[PDB]
């Protein structure tokens with residue numbers, strides 16, 4: 001609806017294209033990642049970001065960028081550097097921030 005919502009939906013679509021496996025698509029469960037909720041205090045994922053856009057909870061691109069960075073930082077905190085997850089998070093973090101200027 002609103003201009004910011006339209007822009008953030010556009011950014012979100014482009015970011016999700018960089019995650020074809022959808023590792024970032026939904027909240028990480030402790031079943032898939034043992035101990036996750038005990039290690040990551042502020043979980044974030046593309047699905048939650050979509051819900052926040054729809055609810056009109058972002059009022060600036062800066063806020064959206066902060067949630068995107070949080071999501072990537074979480075993946076680089078929980079996962080070791082040699083994992084596909086860590087490597088994807090670092091790659092998408094830089095590409096996403098460039099893509100968003």
Ligand SMILES: C/C=C/Cn1cc(-c2cccc(C(=O)N(C)C)c2)c2cc[nH]c2c1=O
Nearest residue numbers: 023024028032033075078079085086088089
């Ligand atoms: C780039 C990752 C972002 C978030 N994330 C997602 C998964 C995840 C989620 C859903 C499915 C799978 C998967 O395909 N597995 C576990 C085989 C992984 C996972 C598993 C261990 N750590 C993580 C993780 O940090």
